[PDB]
C-alpha cells in the first residue's frame, strides 16, 4: 500500500500544481482512471479465444481451399555426426560453420546445408499455422486501423497537434477514446498471453521488448490523461502492419508477384510513416509543444526516452526492410 | 447545467471601450474552457473568443485581434471580455458558452450550456 | 448495455424487497462489487509467472537432487502395422482391442501392450514436469488451506452455520474475506490459463467442468453478498487437495510406502470431508436455512443445483478412490 | 459516528414494567444491527439483547428471555427495550451499542459507537 503511494508520486507524473484529487471522477465529468484498465485482461482472454476459433474454423478451411500444405515438415536423411552437431553445437550454421562441417565430415556444403535446413523446418512450425496466424493478424490490424481512422477523422487534434494539450488536465473521457485504448491494450495483452504460453519456445527479443514498451506507454499515458497524442501514435503505427500480413499470406500461397507488390507497398508505407511522419510530427508535438503548453513535468524524461526507444526499434527494422526491398527489385 | 448569465451591456458611442461580464452559477466552472460568441442580426452565430480553464491559451477571431481581450477570474467564476475601438461590426447579441470536450475548435455545435445572451448597440 | 441490465435482474438474484442500490459502497460501509473481481485476471497472470519460475528454478533442482529421471520417454520398437493402428485406430487399446491386435498381428499380447504403453509414454509428459507441477500444486494448496483455517478460526459462522445470513444483505466486506476470495478466483483463473494454453492437448473433461463451475459459483456468490458460506466450502474442499499432491510426489520418487500411507490418508480425508461433512453441514445451511432466514430468492434454483452438481462430481471421484484404496490395502 | 443517546430511565418499584428507548442521530442506522448491554455495579458489561436491521432476528440473554423484549422502528431511528417482571438483577447502567461487521456474537469488543448510557434503579 505504501509502496504504491511512493510509486504514484504526484510530483513526478502530474505537471506543476496538479494533484490526483483534481482528476477524480465527478458528477458532470468523467476522467480516465487506472482501475478502468483491469478490463483489458478479460478482453484479451476473449480475444485469445476468438483467435483460436478463427484459426481453427475460419482460416484453416481457407488455407485448404488455397492448396496450403496441410502436412508437417520433411524428414532429414540419417547421419550420426550431423545429428550430434545439430543437438550439441548449433541449429543454424553460418558460412564458416558450414565450411567447418564440410571439412570435418568430408561432404559437400550443399548436402549439409540441405540437411540443416530440413532439421530447422522440423523445428519450425508448419506453413498452415503461420498462414492462419498471419490471416488473424491481418484481420485484426485492418479492423484497428480502420476504426482509428474513423475516430481520428472527426477529432480536432489530427490536423493541429497543439490540441492534445488544450485544457490539460481537464479533458473529459469519451466513449470512443476509451474503447480505442481498451481495445489496443487488450490486443497487446493477448499478444503477451500468446507469447508467454503458446510461443514460449520461439521468440523473446525485439518484439517482446516492443510489446512491453507499448504496454508501458499505453498504460501510463492513459493514467496521466495523456491519451490524445497516443491515438496519433497508435493510428500511425498500425498503418503499415496491415500490409506485412497480406504479403506473408501471398508468400505462403506461393504467389510471388503479389507478394513482391504488397511488400514494396508495405516498405513504402513503413518508411514514410515511421521515418518521415513520426519523428517530425509526433516527436515535435511531444518533445517541445507538450513541455511548452503543459509546463515542466518530470514524467517527460520517462516518456520521450521510451518514444525514442521505439524510434530506434523502428529504424533497425527499416534497415532489415531496405535490404529485402533491394532483393525484391 | 451551469447556465451562464451575461451582463454588462448597453449602448456605446463609436470608437468606444466597453467591458462585458459572463457569470456562471456553478462550482465546476473552473475546469471548463469558455467562449464568447456573437449572433449578428439576420446572421448566424460567430466565434468571438475563447479561453482555457487556467488562462493558458486565449484564442481570438481574425477580426477582433488586438481590439478585443478575454480574461477570466476563477474565484469570482466570471469571464470579462474587454472590447476596444468598437467599429459598427460589433453590433449583435453576445452569448457566453462552455466547451464540452475541451476540443479547442471554432464551432457553434461544440459549445453547450449556452446563455440567454446580452445585447450591445454600436453607433 | 441493455442485455447486461437484463441479465442482472434484481428480482432474480437479490431476495425480496432488495435492490442493487442498497449494496452500493457508501461512506461508512464497503460492500463487495463485481468491479472488484477484475483484479483476478492480473493476479492469475502473476501467479502463472510465479509458477513458471518455481517450476524451472525451485522444483527442477529438487527433482534432480531426488534422482527423478531428467530424460524423456523410451523408444518403441519399429512396427508398420502397430504404427498404423496407433496413428489410425486408437492410442489406448483395451482388452478386446489387445486381443484383436494379437489375432491380426499373430503376436503375443504382452509385446503389443508394451509397445502401446511405450507409445503412450512418448505422448505423455515426462516425470520431471509432472513432479514439478505436483510440487507447485502442493505448495499452493497448503498455503490456501492454512490461510483459510487461520481466517475461519476467528469467524462466528464456522461453529454456527446460521451466522452466514445474519444481517443479509448488510454485511460489510472485510480485508481478509476479500483477499481470500480474490486469491481463490485468481488461482482458478491461473488453472484456466494453464489449461487452455499449456495443456490444451491433455484434459478437457471433468476437471474443466469442475473449474468452470467453481469460477461460476465464486463470482456470482461474491456479487450477491453470499460469501460467508462460500469460505466454508472453499476451506472444506481444499483440505484434501494438499495430500493427493504429496502422494503423487512420493510416487514419482519411487517411494511406495509413503505413497501408500499418504494415499490412505488422502482417501480418508476426502471421504470424510466431501461425503460426511459437506452434504449434512453445507447443504443443510444452503437448502433450508438460507431460504428460511433470507426468504424466497430465485437464485437459489441456480446455486443449489450447482452445489449438487459439485456433489455429484465429488461422488464419482470417490468411487475412483475407493477402488485405488482397495488396491492400496 | 451515529452516537446513540439512551433515554427512558428512572427508578421503578419491584415486579414492575419499564420501557427504554435508544435514539441514533444518523441516516444509516437502518442498515446496522444494534444491541442493548448493561454494566452491573462493580462488574463488567453483559449482553442483554440484540436485533438485526429489519427485525428478522432478535437474540436475548439466557437470563432475560420472556421478561425482556427488544424492538426497533426504522422511521424514527429508535430502539425500544421493554422490560417486564423486573427482579433486582436488572440494576445497572444500560448502554445502547451498534454492531460493526454484522457478526451476531455476544461480546463487548465487537460493538462500537457506544453511548454515554442510561441508568435504571430497581428496588
Ligand atoms: C525496457 C523495458 C521498458 C518498460 C518495461 C515494461 C514494464 C511494463 C509492464 C507492466 C505494466 C505496468 C502496469 C500493468 C497493470 C496496470 C496497472 C493499473 O491499471 O493500475 C495500477 C496499479 C494500481 O494502483 P492503485 O490502484 O494503487 O493507484 C490508482 C490511483 N492513482 C490514480 C494514483 C494511480 O498499480 C500498479 O500496477 C503500479 C505499479 C506498476 C508496475 C510498473 C513496473 C515498471
Ligand atoms: C455447466 C457449466 C456451469 C457454468 C458455466 C460456466 C460459466 C462461467 C464462466 C464465466 C464467468 C462469469 C463472469 C466472469 C467475469 C466476471 C464478471 C464481473 O466481475 O462482472 C460482471 C460483468 C460486468 O457487469 P456490470 O459491470 O454491467 O454490472 C455490475 C453491476 N451489478 C452490481 C448490477 C452486477 O458482467 C458480466 O460478465 C455478466 C455476464 C456473465 C456471463 C455469464 C455466462 C453464464
Ligand atoms: C511498435 O513499433 C509500435 C508501438 C506502438 C506505440 C504505442 C504507444 C501509444 C501511447 C503513446 C503515449 C505517449 C504520450 C507521452 C508523450 C509525452
Ligand atoms: C471441486 O470439487 C471443488 C469446488 C470448490 C467450490 C467452490 C465454491 C465456493 C462458492 C460457494 C458459493 C455458494 C453460495 C450459494 C448458496 C445459496
Ligand atoms: C502554483 O500555485 C502556487 C500557490 O497555489 C502559486 O504561488 C504558483 O505561482 C503556482 N505556479 C504555477 C506555475 O501555476
Ligand atoms: C416489501 O415491501 C412492501 C412495501 O415496501 C411491503 O408491503 C411488503 O410487506 C414487503 N415484503 C417483505 C417480505 O418485506
Amino acid at each position: 500500500a505504501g509502496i504504491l503511494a511512493w510509486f504514484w508520486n504526484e510530483r513526478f507524473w502530474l505537471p506543476h500544481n496538479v494533484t490526483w484529487a483534481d482528476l477524480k471522477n465527478t458528477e458532470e465529468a468523467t476522467f480516465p482512471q487506472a482501475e478502468d484498465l483491469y478490463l483489458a485482461f478479460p478482453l484479451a482472454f476473449c480475444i485469445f479465444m476468438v483467435r483460436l476459433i478463427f484459426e481453427r474454423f475460419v482460416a484453416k478451411p481457407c488455407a485448404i481451399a488455397l492448396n496450403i500444405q496441410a502436412n508437417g515438415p520433411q524428414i532429414a536423411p540419417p547421419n550420426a555426426i550431423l545429428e550430434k552437431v545439430f543437438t550439441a553445437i548449433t541449429k543454424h550454421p553460418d558460412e564458416k560453420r558450414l565450411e567447418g562441417l564440410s571439412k570435418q565430415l568430408d561432404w559437400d556444403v550443399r548436402s549439409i546445408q540441405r540437411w540443416f535446413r530440413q532439421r530447422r523446418n522440423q523445428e519450425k512450425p508448419s506453413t498452415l499455422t503461420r498462414f492462419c496466424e498471419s490471416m488473424w493478424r491481418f484481420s485484426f490490424y485492418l479492423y484497428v486501423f480502420t476504426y482509428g481512422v474513423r475516430f481520428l477523422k472527426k477529432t480536432p487534434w489530427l490536423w493541429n497537434t497543439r490540441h492534445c494539450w488544450y485544457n490539460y488536465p481537464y479533458q473529459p473521457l469519451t466513449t470512443d477514446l476509451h474503447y480505442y485504448y481498451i481495445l489496443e491494450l487488450s490486443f497487446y495483452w493477448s499478444l503477451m498471453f500468446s507469447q508467454f504460453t503458446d510461443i514460449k519456445r520461439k521468440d523473446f527479443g525485439i518484439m517482446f521488448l516492443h510489446h512491453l514498451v507499448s504496454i508501458f506507454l499505453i498504460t501510463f499515458s492513459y493514467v496521466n490523461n495523456m491519451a490524445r497524442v497516443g491515438t496519433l501514435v497508435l493510428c500511425l503505427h498500425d498503418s503499415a502492419d496491415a500490409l506485412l500480413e497480406a504479403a506473408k499470406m501471398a508468400n505462403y500461397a506461393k504467389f510471388q508477384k503479389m507478394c513482391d507488390l504488397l511488400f514494396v507497398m508495405f516498405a513504402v508505407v513503413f518508411i514514410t510513416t515511421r521515418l518521415g511522419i513520426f519523428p517530425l510530427w509526433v516527436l515535435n508535438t511531444t518533445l517541445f509543444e507538450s513541455w511548452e503548453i503543459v509546463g515542466p513535468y518530470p514524467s517527460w524524461w520517462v516518456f520521450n526516452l521510451l518514444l525514442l526507444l521505439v524510434q530506434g526499434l523502428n529504424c533497425f527494422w527499416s534497415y532489415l526492410i531496405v535490404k529485402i526491398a533491394c532483393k525484391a527489385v | 447545467q451551469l447556465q451562464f448569465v451575461e451582463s454588462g451591456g448597453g449602448l456605446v458611442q463609436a470608437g468606444g471601450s466597453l467591458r462585458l461580464s459572463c457569470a456562471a452559477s456553478g462550482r465546476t466552472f473552473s475546469r471548463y474552457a469558455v467562449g464568447w460568441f456573437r449572433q449578428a442580426p439576420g446572421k448566424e452565430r460567430e466565434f468571438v473568443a475563447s479561453i482555457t480553464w487556467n488562462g493558458a491559451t486565449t484564442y481570438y477571431a481574425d477580426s477582433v485581434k488586438g481590439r478585443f481581450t478575454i480574461s477570466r477570474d476563477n474565484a469570482k467564476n466570471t469571464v470579462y471580455l474587454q472590447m476596444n475601438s468598437l467599429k459598427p461590426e460589433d453590433t449583435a447579441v453576445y452569448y457566453c458558452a462552455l466547451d464540452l470536450y475541451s476540443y479547442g475548435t471554432r464551432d457553434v455545435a461544440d459549445f453547450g450550456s449556452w446563455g440567454k445572451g446580452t445585447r450591445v448597440t454600436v453607433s
Side-chain angles (χ1 to χ4, degrees), chain A residues 100-102 105 107 111-112 115-116 121-123 125-198 200 204-253 255-256 258-259 261-262:
Chain A
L101 290 175
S102 62
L105 193 66
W107 270 62
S111 301
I112 301 181
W115 186 90
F116 272 90
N121 296 330
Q122 292 181 64
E123 290 187 344
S126 60
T127 312
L128 198 72
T129 61
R130 293 189 292 184
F131 181 85
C132 296
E133 190 260 11
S134 299
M135 203 176 183
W136 162 254
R137 280 180 168 265
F138 167 79
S139 301
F140 206 97
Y141 276 139
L142 186 62
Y143 169 65
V144 175
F145 178 69
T146 298
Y147 175 68
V149 167
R150 293 191 300 103
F151 163 70
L152 285 187
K153 178 164 60 57
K154 62 181 68 180
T155 56
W157 57 90
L158 170 88
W159 319 106
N160 188 340
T161 54
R162 302 171 59 91
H163 277 195
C164 323
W165 321 103
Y166 179 65
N167 216 30
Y168 192 87
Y170 305 123
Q171 297 168 343
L173 181 66
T174 59
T175 58
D176 307 2
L177 174 46
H178 175 70
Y179 173 74
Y180 198 5
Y181 251 85
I182 293 300
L183 173 65
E184 284 279 6
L185 196 53
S186 306
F187 175 65
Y188 276 102
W189 281 119
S190 176
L191 289 185
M192 279 286 96
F193 297 166
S194 295
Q195 186 173 355
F196 271 117
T197 65
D198 294 339
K200 179 59 163 60
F204 258 74
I206 305 291
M207 284 272 179
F208 176 79
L209 173 63
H210 178 281
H211 287 350
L212 263 185
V213 171
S214 302
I215 297 182
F216 192 101
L217 283 179
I218 292 178
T219 297
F220 295 125
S221 64
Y222 183 84
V223 305
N224 211 31
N225 220 17
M226 298 196 179
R228 274 188 188 187
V229 74
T231 55
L232 295 184
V233 190
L234 289 172
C235 184
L236 185 65
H237 281 264
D238 304 359
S239 59
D241 282 309
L243 296 177
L244 180 59
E245 315 297 328
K248 292 182 178 181
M249 290 200 310
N251 181 29
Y252 293 148
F255 296 161
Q256 195 36 58
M258 215 84 86
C259 166
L261 191 146
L262 301 176

Side-chain angles (χ1 to χ4, degrees), chain B residues 38 67-68 83 85-86 88 90-92 94 120 122:
Chain B
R38 56 178 170 198
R67 326 184 20 227
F68 283 21
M83 320 147 77
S85 306
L86 275 66
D90 289 345
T91 286
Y94 286 65
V120 175
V122 162

Side-chain angles (χ1 to χ4, degrees), chain A residues 2-10 12-19:
Chain A
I3 193 67
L4 295 181
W6 170 81
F7 184 68
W8 292 114
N9 190 19
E10 62 182 17
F12 172 78
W13 301 98
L14 304 181
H16 214 108
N17 276 358
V18 178
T19 60

Side-chain angles (χ1 to χ4, degrees), chain A residues 17 21-23 26 28-29 31 151 154-157 160 162-163 166-172 174 228 293, chain B residues 2 28 30-34 50-54 56-57 59 98-106 111 113:
Chain A
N17 276 358
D22 277 12
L23 292 178
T26 59
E28 203 197 12
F31 300 94
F151 163 70
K154 62 181 68 180
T155 56
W157 57 90
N160 188 340
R162 302 171 59 91
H163 277 195
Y166 179 65
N167 216 30
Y168 192 87
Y170 305 123
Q171 297 168 343
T174 59
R228 274 188 188 187
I293 315 161
Chain B
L2 299 108
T28 48
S30 290
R31 312 162 86 83
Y32 284 105
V34 297
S50 94
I51 191 169
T52 51
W53 77 275
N54 75 70
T57 314
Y59 275 160
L98 181 130
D99 210 319
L100 312 151
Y101 316 94
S102 304
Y103 267 4
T105 57
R106 287 174 160 73
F111 289 87
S113 178

